[PDB]
Amino acid sequence: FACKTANGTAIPIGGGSANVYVNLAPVVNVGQNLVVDLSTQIFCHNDYPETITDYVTLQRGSAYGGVLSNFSGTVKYSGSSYPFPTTSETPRVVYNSRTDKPWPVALYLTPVSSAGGVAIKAGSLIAVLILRQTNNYNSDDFQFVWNIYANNDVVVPT
Ligand SMILES: CO[C@H]1O[C@H](CO)[C@@H](O)[C@H](O)[C@@H]1O[C@H]1O[C@H](CO)[C@@H](O)[C@H](O)[C@@H]1O
């Protein structure tokens, strides 16, 4: 089991960490949702699907920078909503193919009432998403750490 980003950064067998730079809606109003869809940026595959089945959870979702300070939101994992920050390991997603399959994570953030101006600064850390991978074959327990960075400013009009 290994994962790669749309840009090309790979985390090999055994886990690791990588940086993901995401484009963001450049304007968001109070009452609107800023969507961070990582299912288009992070992909994974099962290296030995003929005999092994890999299981993948969202172990932890942390908020940073302007997202931590100016936003409140949820995380959508494999079609279901969970609190963000995610404080407990989610249910499992099955990876049973060698062809790359997206990691179905997406953040839905809304600006807080007091937000205004540059709510997210370009190049800043906004989130860390930890992908925990196991299997039905041995005791493998690997963490794929995804550091989510904003490519551009996100402004809240005032
Ligand atoms: C075939 O190589 C994989 O399987 C053997 C055991 O059959 C492992 O010892 C080896 O490290 C490889 O495991 C990788 O791929 C597995 C299936 O994707 C995954 O379950 C492992 O955690 C590891 O990534």
Side-chain angles (χ1 to χ4, degrees):
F1 182 92
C3 301
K4 61 185 188 176
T5 65
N7 175 187
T9 310
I11 306 185
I13 294 162
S17 76
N19 296 328
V20 189
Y21 301 86
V22 298
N23 297 329
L24 302 171
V27 188
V28 189
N29 294 279
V30 175
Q32 270 191 322
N33 282 322
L34 169 55
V35 178
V36 192
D37 183 10
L38 294 136
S39 86
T40 67
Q41 310 289 124
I42 304 169
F43 307 88
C44 304
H45 72 271
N46 181 332
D47 275 315
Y48 198 8
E50 299 78 5
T51 66
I52 310 180
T53 300
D54 291 331
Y55 302 94
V56 168
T57 69
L58 172 65
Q59 180 183 299
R60 181 183 195 107
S62 298
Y64 294 100
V67 166
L68 172 66
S69 302
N70 304 316
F71 282 85
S72 92
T74 68
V75 59
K76 200 196 173 169
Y77 189 64
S78 196
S80 286
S81 293
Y82 302 85
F84 180 77
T86 315
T87 61
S88 56
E89 179 171 25
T90 63
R92 305 163 104 77
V93 171
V94 168
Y95 285 72
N96 54 11
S97 178
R98 196 169 283 97
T99 169
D100 287 308
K101 171 190 188 178
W103 195 37
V105 184
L107 302 177
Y108 288 84
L109 321 163
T110 198
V112 299
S113 299
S114 70
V118 183
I120 298 171
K121 293 181 64 181
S124 75
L125 179 74
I126 63 174
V128 170
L129 306 175
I130 296 169
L131 179 164
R132 189 179 193 175
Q133 174 253 325
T134 61
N135 58 37
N136 66 347
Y137 170 80
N138 61 15
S139 283
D140 280 2
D141 187 356
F142 300 136
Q143 280 176 247
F144 293 69
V145 179
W146 304 104
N147 305 311
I148 317 303
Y149 287 85
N151 266 336
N152 55 271
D153 288 342
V154 180
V155 173
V156 177
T158 61

